[PDB]
Amino acid sequence: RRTKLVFDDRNYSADHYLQEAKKLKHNADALSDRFEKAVYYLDAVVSFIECGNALEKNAQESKSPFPMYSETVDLIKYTMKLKNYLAPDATAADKRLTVLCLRCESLLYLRLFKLKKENALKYSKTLTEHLKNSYNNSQAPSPGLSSVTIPQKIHQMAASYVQVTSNFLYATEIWDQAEQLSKEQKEFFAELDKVMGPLIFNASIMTDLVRYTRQGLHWLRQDAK
């Protein structure tokens, strides 16, 4: 009854995946039934992730995927606001689709982190030392028996460090969200894990996520369509 997708083992250009995802996103923009709207939005999201993955591993011309993954995260956030999973009459299809969306969003946040992760150790070093090194403007030292002044570069560095750290903070929270929600469709997702191999937080690559989500979408389609 359940069938596994035989996957296209070509590595097309990022432009090809971008056009594919735009076609799917506009199919979804046109549709009126929110569930099929959301299914096609997740299909487009998978193609967008493929476009970013191609921007990364394009052998003879590599560009940056960070805006791609970020805007795709925003697309997933929009998508989840159509068929709310915590709704009273929320079907099993809505819940499984939400779990797939959450997996995609968590892993995309994690990549967004890892694309700029090199800055954060550097910045943690120097920002820890300088934020023990800021004690001014309100109380002078008080020998015994408010507002704070910090250097400009320290401020910009703290801003960028928070910007980079928010990414895995969201990734961790959304991954735990996905884990928890998967308990209410444990059988569906145990079969999916058995067929595809489970998604690993810090290990699964974008192609693993693409194939896993496409398999889940295939089963969701057959259960409704």
Q: How many structural domains compose the chain?
A: 1
Spatial CB neighbours of 39, under 8 Å, sequence gap ≥ 6: 28, 97, 217, 220, 221
Mutual angle of helices 186-196 and 206-224, in 10-degree steps:
130
From residue 140, alpha-carbon distances to 96, 129, 130, 143, 202 in Å are 58, 20, 18, 10, 46
Are residues 47 and 17 in contact, defined by beta-carbon separation less than 8 angstroms? yes
Spatial CB neighbours of 69, under 8 Å, sequence gap ≥ 6: 49, 52, 108, 111, 112, 115
Spatial CB neighbours of 193, under 8 Å, sequence gap ≥ 6: 199
* Residue 159 buriedness (CB in 10 A; 0-12 / 13-18 / 19+): exposed
Are residues 91 and 39 in contact, defined by beta-carbon separation less than 8 angstroms? no
**DSSP assignment of 159-179, as one string?**
HHHHHHHHHHHHHHHHHHHHH
Residue 178, amino acid: A
Report resolution (Å) to 1 decimal.
2.2
Spatial CB neighbours of 126, under 8 Å, sequence gap ≥ 6: 154, 157
Q: How many CB atoms lie within 10 A of CB 100?
A: 27
Q: Give the residue among 224, 200, 212 at the shortest CA–CA distance from 83.
A: 224
The rounded distance, in Å, linking the Cα atoms of 23 and 17 is 10
Structural element, H or E, at residue 142: none
Backbone phi, psi, residue 138, to 5°: -120, -55
Phi-psi sector, 6: left (phi>0), alpha (psi -120 to 50), beta: beta
Are residues 168 and 109 in contact, defined by beta-carbon separation less than 8 angstroms? yes
Residue with tokens 């099929």: 36
Spatial CB neighbours of 219, under 8 Å, sequence gap ≥ 6: 2, 96, 188, 192
From residue 196, alpha-carbon distances to 42, 188, 204, 206 in Å are 18, 12, 12, 14
Residues spanned by the domain of 51: 1-140+146-225
- Torsion (CA) 203, 205, 206, 211 in degrees, nearest 10: -100
Method: X-ray
Residue with tokens 């023990």: 132
The rounded distance, in Å, linking the Cα atoms of 218 and 15 is 24
